[PDB]
Design a protein around this nucleic acid. Sequence first.
DNA 1: TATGGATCCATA
DNA 2: TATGGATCCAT
Lengths: 208, 198
Amino acid sequence: MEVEKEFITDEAKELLSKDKLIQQAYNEVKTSICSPIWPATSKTFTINNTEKNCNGVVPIKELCYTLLEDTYNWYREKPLDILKLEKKKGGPIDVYKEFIENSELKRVGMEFETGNISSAHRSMNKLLLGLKHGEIDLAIILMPIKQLAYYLTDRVTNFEELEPYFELTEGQPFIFIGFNAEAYNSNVPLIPKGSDGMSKRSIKKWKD
Amino acid sequence: MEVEKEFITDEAKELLSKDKLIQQAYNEVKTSICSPIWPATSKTFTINNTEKNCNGVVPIKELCYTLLEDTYNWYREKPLDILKLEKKKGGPIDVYKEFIENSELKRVGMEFETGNISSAHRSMNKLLLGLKHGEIDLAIILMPIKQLAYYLTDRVTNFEELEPYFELTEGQPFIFIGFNAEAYNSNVPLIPKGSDGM
DNA sequence: TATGGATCCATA
DNA sequence: TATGGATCCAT
């Protein structure tokens, strides 16, 4: 997979230039998102382009999550205190990791959005909320770009469609990454939808 | 239909206290939202409570829009300049109306959310964007409360689920209103569904 | 009566 | 075209 579009707030740029732990986080994220391939035996991600919305989204994230969790030690389902404890309503964050080096600690929250575009607004607000309540120091949202999404389940989150709203995270450190396949072709197999595209891996939950 | 819950940012409270144009927009929407009845012969909104999520959501909004549009003169699908003109990306706002009186104009935008709860965040954000850009002066969101939603299509916007995010509108004039059915009864007809997604 | 999602719809 | 929406799913 390749990263083709990115939006970095000014606040995230400042941390990205001076801060080594943030620098480290970003690198683990980029490398993880560039890792997905299709098919499994290939060295790049090629997507079937026979027709509009022909592919399901589930399997596309697998290799990204595996790398973060198993090679980089990020956790899944970290709940925010403002939600679990105070409001007692609202689910957790997709991915999370604490980066420590001597006295320094940096907490990063991230959501890899492949749901409907409307869900991304939710992920965005949810990260907004943990940033404003001091629970995370940087927020990251990963999603496909529009070109890629043309061949995915209809209406999934795409960079270009969320882009007019990026402006609502100003004043906070946030990074938006739009990924695209490295090739389009109808020789490759279709990513399955439904149960068949379902992940069957055990996930590294924060509660462990 | 009844209005059962409401959250008014302190900024909207001020306006609702001082502004007549604002009070008028408010009473209009309230009257309209209290509009829906079921069945069509009834004087109130009765909802078939046979099973969880047994009713569809479309025909619920009908009578509310009708009053807004036909009686009160609000306009549907009003595009925002930041999106249609500047960013050149994005859809319009659901209901809009200009309150003009003397040298005064009050611009109100409103979203009647019956889509997935996730959508509600899109609506909230789009209305925050119009507020931030000075295109509207008050933003309002109407949604079912959880009790009523329980009988509607699974996962539709419900007051209580959006509630933890109200604070994201802080500093802005906003109004969230949650409506409920006047009664529940298994003898009234089911609100039909469509064939969306799955 | 919990909650993030995954999928397809209809009208431009 | 592009966009808001509706409908069930999985844990």
